[PDB]
Curated annotation (Swiss-Prot):
The chain holds residues 2 to 454 of 867 of the full protein. This is Alanine--tRNA ligase. Binds 1 zinc ion per subunit. It is found in: Cytoplasm. It is an enzyme of class 6 (ligase). It comes from Aquifex aeolicus (strain VF5). Its cofactor is Zn(2+). Consists of three domains; the N-terminal catalytic domain, the editing domain and the C-terminal C-Ala domain. The editing domain removes incorrectly charged amino acids, while the C-Ala domain, along with tRNA(Ala), serves as a bridge to cooperatively bring together the editing and aminoacylation centers thus stimulating deacylation of misacylated tRNAs. The Aquifex aeolicus domain can be used in vitro to replace the corresponding domain in E.coli. Catalyzes the attachment of alanine to tRNA(Ala) in a two-step reaction: alanine is first activated by ATP to form Ala-AMP and then transferred to the acceptor end of tRNA(Ala). Also edits incorrectly charged Ser-tRNA(Ala) and Gly-tRNA(Ala) via its editing domain. Keywords: Aminoacyl-tRNA synthetase, ATP-binding, Cytoplasm, Ligase, Metal-binding, Nucleotide-binding, Protein biosynthesis, RNA-binding, tRNA-binding, Zinc. The lineage of its organism: Bacteria, Pseudomonadati, Aquificota, Aquificia, Aquificales. Its EC number is 6.1.1.7.
């Protein structure tokens, strides 16, 4: 019913209709936060304002934020392709108070938007609050008029938010849509909005004291809500994503929705195309460490799944064109970076494709021999070969082996690394013993 592009502008213009200043998406890469690789949510750009370190001409903000979930405590990379809900890159709609309005308004606005602007039947909406948050329950039940039967009081894991282990925190309220009895669990009661009531400060001892000025933080995933409004069962079948699945079909000659493993590769390519396009446009260069390596991995993973579909040549650079053309309205700057991003991608593909094929042969070889001889893991040496000789990211090796039931000898791989680190001994820096763990985020040459 509503195009993804349409949903975005509405959200923005609706909150703009209420004192909110439309702040544009901060780049995926944090200008000054060398600890965090990518912006993973809404408030990150606004973090200091929520703390009182940065002032702002406004007390109300709204935005559609370019987000990546490929690092640290918010890392969905391992799941991308296997489900219908996970992303590397995605857009988050948010409304924030610093701290002007609190729970009531945040709830009032959110209810209005979902009922009036989104036009979703109110009897098909469920809400969750923190069991100890009586104020929030009250607002929903009495003031908004949600029957007690469509309100959930849940615990800390479900309804309490924290900025970190210390600092600003508070209860949260999530809005769900009952998609029908034809579904199950969180797929039936699909969350579309998370409202955060930044109410408390947690000190170094874990004690919670009230904040002088309560804050508001919210997040609504654009791809997910669009799937509800477009009646889709997957984020990948939406107007602004499905064309990329079709790009995968056209190049491979395989069809979506026939074989599960075929769809996985298709979803991986479609999603990764958006990630690489947006990251390289925002200034990231594929390298062997940090932000550059995460995208190298993403790009390599996509190359691998395409080759799994029988694509013997580079194709990912062609997909950039589609993404740019699909996302040029809300992000007109993607057009200035188009050819630049395309060239970078093609060069990366061209640089690694032959080494990927040769590596896949080696990996499938030792994998096959291990099954013939009754081995349940790839030895440390074999993992080091594919990682060092063929430049395969560890996570990728672990995933290819996982396809046939084999794990990877982690202690043996750690051992092998010290022995290699030793060849120089007898950029990036690793504690000894960290090396096994550090190798999941850097290329072999970086060690």
């Amino acid at each position: 019913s509503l195009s993804a592009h349409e949903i975005r502008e509405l959200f923005l213009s609706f909150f703009e209709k209420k004192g909110h200043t439309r702040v544009k998406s901060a780049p995926l890469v944090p200008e000054n936060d060398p600890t965090l690789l990518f912006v993973n949510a809404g408030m990150v750009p606004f973090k200091n304002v929520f703390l009182g370190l940065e002032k702002r001409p406004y007390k109300r903000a709204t935005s559609c934020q370019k987000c990546l979930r490929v690092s640290g405590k918010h890392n969905d990379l391992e799941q991308v392709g296997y489900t219908s809900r996970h992303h590397t890159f995605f857009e988050m709609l948010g409304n924030f108070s610093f701290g002007d309005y609190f729970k009531k308004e945040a709830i009032e606005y959110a209810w209005e938007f979902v009922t009036e602007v989104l036009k979703l039947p109110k009897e098909k909406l469920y809400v969750s609050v923190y069991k100890d948050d009586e104020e929030a329950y009250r607002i929903w039940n009495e003031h908004i008029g949600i029957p007690s039967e469509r309100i959930w009081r849940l615990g800390e894991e479900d309804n309490f938010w924290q900025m970190g282990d210390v600092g600003p925190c508070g209860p949260s309220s999530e809005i769900y849509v009952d998609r029908g009895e034809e579904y199950e669990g969180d797929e039936r009661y699909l969350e579309i909005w998370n409202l955060v009531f930044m109410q408390y400060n947690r000190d170094e001892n874990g004690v919670l004291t009230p904040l002088p000025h309560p804050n508001i933080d919210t997040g609504m995933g654009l791809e997910r809500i669009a799937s509800v409004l477009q009646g889709k069962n997957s984020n990948f079948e939406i107007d602004i994503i499905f064309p990329l699945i079709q790009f995968g079909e056209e190049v491979s000659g395989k069809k979506y929705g026939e074989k599960f493993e075929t769809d996985v590769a298709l979803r991986v390519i479609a999603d990764h195309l958006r990630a690489i396009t947006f990251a390289i446009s925002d200034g990231v260069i594929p390298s062997n460490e940090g932000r550059g390596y995460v995208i190298r991995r993403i790009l390599r993973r996509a190359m691998r799944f395409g080759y799994k579909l029988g694509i013997e040549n580079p194709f990912l650079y062609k997909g950039v064109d589609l993404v740019v053309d699909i996302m040029k309205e809300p992000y007109p700057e993607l057009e200035l970076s188009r050819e630049f991003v395309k060239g970078i991608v093609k060069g990366e593909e061209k640089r690694f494709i032959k080494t990927l094929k040769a590596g896949m042969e080696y990996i499938q070889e030792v994998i096959q021999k291990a099954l013939e001889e009754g081995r349940k893991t790839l030895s440390g040496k074999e993992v080091f070969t594919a990682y060092d000789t063929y430049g395969f990211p560890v996570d990728l090796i672990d995933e290819i082996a996982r396809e046939k039931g084999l794990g990877i000898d982690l202690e043996g791989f750690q051992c092998e690394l010290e022995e290699q680190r030793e060849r120089a001994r007898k950029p990036v820096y690793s504690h000894l013993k960290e090396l096994g763990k550090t190798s999941a985020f850097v290329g072999a040459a970086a060690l």
